[PDB]
Amino acid sequence: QANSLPPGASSPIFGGSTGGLLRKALVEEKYLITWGSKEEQVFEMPTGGAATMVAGVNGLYLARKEQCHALHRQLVAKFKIRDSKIYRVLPNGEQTLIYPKDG
């Protein structure tokens, strides 16, 4: 609805927390990380708790760019995923890439 993934990305299985999005994601900006997993594997949320990512492309909406970057560095340091793309999402739905810029 208000937090809709791009087509091609499936949601990871998470029972939803209280560390996540607030009114700023409705009104100013939010951030979106998409990564590619080969299997279903258990990762720590940057906002508290644990989630399971399914095989395929997983997308997750976070309030800050550092939460997405910490999730990406945890995916590198534990589960060896290096194709996370971090986007900046405006409230009108315009999409821009912010990590990596170089390619």
Binding site: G15, S17, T18, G19, V42, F43, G48, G49, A50, T52
Partner: protein, 78 residues
């Protein structure tokens, strides 16, 4: 002096070990927490609403401080 000193000593040793309890629960959280072990259990679901716990603790701490020490300050003032 035995009564004052035994009560006072065992109170202080008790308070020190409770702060150590909080210390090693935090040290477990940094070092020995595994997301692979704790899915949807009591320990994982506590982290999942930790803002609610700490904010409600913040409110009851404010309530207790007003409704005990402001009574003492009222008694000072009157």
């Amino acid at each position: 002096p035995t009564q004052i000193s035994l009560f006072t000593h065992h109170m202080w040793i008790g308070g020190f070990l409770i702060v150590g309890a909080g210390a090693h629960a935090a040290i477990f959280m940094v070092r020995d927490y595994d997301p692979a072990v704790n899915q949807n259990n009591l320990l994982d679901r506590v982290l999942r609403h930790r803002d609610a716990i700490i904010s409600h603790l913040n409110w009851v701490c404010l309530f207790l401080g007003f409704h005990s020490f402001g009574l003492y300050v009222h008694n000072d003032t009157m």
